[PDB]
Amino acid sequence: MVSTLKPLKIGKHTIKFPIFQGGMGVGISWDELAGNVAKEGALGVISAVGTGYYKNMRFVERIVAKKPFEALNFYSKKALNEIFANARKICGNNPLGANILYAINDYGRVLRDSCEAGANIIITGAGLPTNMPEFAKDFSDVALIPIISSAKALKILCKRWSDRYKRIPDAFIVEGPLSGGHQGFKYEDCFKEEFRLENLVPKVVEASKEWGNIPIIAAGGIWDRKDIDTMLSLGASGVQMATRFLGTKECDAKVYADLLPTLKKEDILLIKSPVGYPARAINTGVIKRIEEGNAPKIACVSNCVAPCNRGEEAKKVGYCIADGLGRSYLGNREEGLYFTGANGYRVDKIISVHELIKELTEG
Template sequence: MSEKMPELYFGDLKAEVPIVQGGMGVGISMSSLASAVANEGGVGVISAAEIGFIREEFARNPKEANTLALEEEIKKAKSLSKKGIIGVNIMVALTEFIDLIKASIKAGADILFCGAGLPLTVPIEEIKESGIKFGVIVSSAKATTLIFKYWDRHYGVIPDAVVVEGPKAGGHLGFRYEQIDNPDFELEKIVPPVLDAVKVYEEKYNKKIPTIAAGGIYTGEDIYKFINKIGVDGVQMATRFVATHECDADIRFKEAYVNCKKEDITIIRSPVGLPGRAIKNKFLEDVEEGKKQPFKCIWQCLKGCEYRKAPYCITQALISAQKGVFKSGFAFAGSNAYRINKIVSVKELMDELKADYAKAVRSEE
């Protein structure tokens, strides 16, 4: 077996390395990180979530700021990357979901990854016409079938890729609280039924749909296992890309990863009504103790956010954290964040992953 990781194909679009850098909001994965990953042959992904915070009109006109900032970041990432693929992560739960898809198409993104809700209603004509690839992020075979069945019936096409995200991921999770540590829901268990669900539509459409595993994948050996033993075509990794020089967050955000211990990684009840994985800090402890951070909602950014009942504004907290201001925010992180002990370049990280993958191949022979 080749010691080299296999290439990852989205139809005619090829990534030399089967690694998708997971989209990270707010402002953690923008043009700097995404272009660095693309330059190493992977898929670099910009998070669209409230990306307008980098523009001065954000408070006045968040909608315009978000679409303009997203277009700018896509164009910047494209110009900074000599090769590789630039994608955009757009949460279905964002009120501007459709506008952000259109902005991504306009700015020339190669692929979209849409999760945090079921991407059923989409601007299909624009998607078809532009040729942009559309990936869905799911946490179960049931959701996969639902989306594919809907697209098949209503649009006569199917999505181009499936990312299966397990409960070890960072950020908001597509699981109920009690499922997170239940071994029946671990990534290794939820991927095979998704592969079966996708296969039905691959056969119907005679089209290869790459399936990508995400959540807790940390080493080259993990990549080897998921590709060669479990049968996915690629992996999506986010946590490891935070601790890189190129990651778009403030150095203090990256240091929070380097300095955290296993017991600091916790599950929070996000104001959006979903569980999320984050690094514990004073801000989260205060929230836990019932202290509220009064705020006026100026954005209405998320469809499910009951902001009148929320103890704090998730967008404000994540923007503060992106800027390294943890007294009013916190860092989302995957379950393996505590294993990180230094900040490296994206190239160093990719080289390490490739070398460990090769080692795993050799140890099987």
């Protein structure tokens, strides 16, 4: 209840604690997780990726081979609407974010869908999102947050946004190479000390100085209050954490509650991805199937990312990311694809979102 962490302003919104729960697809950070996180006073973030899978394709107009047909159904507006409404049944009008990656067919469509669903903040990575305000202009109060890997990207994004829209980002998330999901670094760079989050954050904060000290949120490998305090002492205004929340009871992908307490460090690895960035996965499910010669058949149905070119890169790397993550959300241990931060092996007990926030904020 008593904390020395101070509330964080992002645009017109305020969160009690300077903590983001990072967005996680597919079906990992939806209404239960984000709702309870926001209820606790942190920023709950709803992933807008693969919402067609929500409640086993409850809100898709067409299904092929048990998959949402095309990007209009993979990124389902009605599903997103219901997820946000259900989250607000828990967290009321407490701020909620919507996370949507840049490298998609229909980026503006999904951003505006998130705004119309009630998002207070849009968070976008997996690319250089130089045009978020173009699609946000009808929603003046929604804060816009790019995820970056470098101070150079901060400078570029601010200059482009300022020149074109007379607006700059409301915050920046700098994500390091210990994070879950995809990495904003080449595989070889993920292991180099120059790109450790403790080295990225000071550079991004110094670059931020020139544009009015836009708040900086450090993400990737942050485990406990000590890591939070380190990042804050390096100039960050807040932190974004995901793996800790991946190990909470309120996680919307229930499989993780059984997978994480058994997870060993040697079973976490960086793999190739149809998205075109290294992805940090657990060596289980579809990965194992690929190595046995029983890889699921690949034929693009959901058209989930532009860099893949409708199955070309999926066939090259050996798996479809939409199919695998959807199967994971639907409970497929044999063929699901499972992601984790580097810290995933440190999850022993599955605890409540409430006790996690208490651990992170007490004192």
